[PDB]
Homo-oligomer: A and B are copies of this chain.
Amino acid sequence: MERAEILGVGTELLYGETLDTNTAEIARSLKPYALKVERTLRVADEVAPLAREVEEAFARARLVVLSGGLGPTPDDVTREAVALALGEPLELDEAVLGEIEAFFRARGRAMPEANRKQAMRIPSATWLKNPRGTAPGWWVRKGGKDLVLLPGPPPEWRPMWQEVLPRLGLPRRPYAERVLKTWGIGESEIVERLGPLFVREEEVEVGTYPKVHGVEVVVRGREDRVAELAERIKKKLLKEVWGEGEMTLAEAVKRRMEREGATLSTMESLTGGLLGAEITRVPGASRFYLGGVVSYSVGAKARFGVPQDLLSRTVSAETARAMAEAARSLFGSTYALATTGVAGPDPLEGEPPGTVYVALAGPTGAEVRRYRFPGDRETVRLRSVYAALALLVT
């Protein structure tokens, strides 16, 4: 399989002063083709380093795509870099120069001298029309290789890329991917359960990505291999998979409450309202979520029904159970969730940061899960939210 190289040009991209979504978006558009994307680059607006990166990318790849630096400014140098990298001179296209003059005439302005350089192309390039912006793009076919220069602004380049891409004659490969969202199983145990199913090959691969909402498992590559492989993986992870694709825990909870015609409330200590925030992130939450309380002080815990004998051990399974039962009673909801624990940075009741209990109470009784989350304060808080949501969808 041959390579695709993707370079986003712009000094500000290095520093995240513009968030580089271009290179990712181009990479995802190449999924249907038999090309390997091994890396993406973001490159400073300097002609010599950029020419070097372009020359190296072009040498190793069937396709090179560059985005950005097609402006009129001294910091727009991609055309110069590309010409330098490919050993071709820049040539003024008078007709395209006329088009750029027209762009400014149409807005009531003369063309600035600076923009004149946007009418430059190398002999190996055909123009890609840009009816939304000043700078036409290039399509270079050289050596059985393709190099495409696109403008930085998405509303400019997306239609240009969409039209040129099926013209490049790229090898096609029937592609699929399957994303499995788990909870309550760490990467190590997933490794062990999958064994040889944890395939890393050219035709198909398996990846795990640990998130605050649990470990995601992604199978991607050839459509035949993916469907089979991912189905075996799902069967092996069956109890821990709570959703696939775009599903989120908050959406999964909503689906269960709608399926049952049930309602929900919450009582939170350490998460501070973040659980209610996460449940109500999803439009239509008011159909099942009656509301909640944030029992942050001891006085509030007692006010909302935590038994007095548990106030010395609010970090405990017993208190979690009591809080969920109290919320269920206080709101008259079908179910209720509770969070209690040690966020960090300090211990609480002799328990170390990351000690968390979550509880769910319902018409058949309550249940509690204990966690010892590694992470700083903000992290432990977030895992706690998802742990509590996970009690509803296992």
Contact = CB atoms under 8 A, between A and B. Distances in A.
Given A292-B293, A292-B296, A293-B293, A114 B273 contact: no
A276 B294 contact: yes
Contacts of A178: none
Given A24-B14, A280-B296, A133 B374 contact: yes
A103 B377 CA distance: 18
B37 A40 contact: no
A340 B174 CA distance: 46
Interface in A55-89: 71-75
Nearest to A210: B71
What is the total number of copies of this protein in its complex?
2
Nearest to A12: B209
Would you call the interface of chain A mostly helix, strand, loop, or mixed?
A: mixed
A95 interface: no
Contacts of A153: 210, 379
Contact of A72 (B17, B188, B278, B345): B188
A254 interface: no
Interface string A191-205: 110000010100001
Given A19-B19, A27-B14, A300-B290, A277 B280 contact: no
Interface in A322-348: 330-332, 344-346
Contact of A16 (B17, B24, B108): B24
B28 A39 contact: no
A241 B44 CA distance: 25
A11 interface: yes
Contact of A276 (B11, B286, B296): B296
B290 A296 contact: yes
A375 interface: yes
17 contacts: A11-B207, A12-B218, A37-B44, A39-B53, A112-B188, A112-B189, A115-B188, A153-B210, A155-B378, A155-B379, A271-B277, A273-B274, A281-B377, A281-B381, A283-B377, A291-B294, A294-B294
Interface of A: 10-21, 23-25, 27-28, 37-46, 49, 53, 71-75, 103, 106-108, 112-115, 132-134, 153, 155-156, 186-192, 198, 200, 205-210, 218, 265-266, 268, 271-281, 283, 285-286, 289-297, 299-300, 303-304, 330-332, 344-346, 372, 374-379, 381
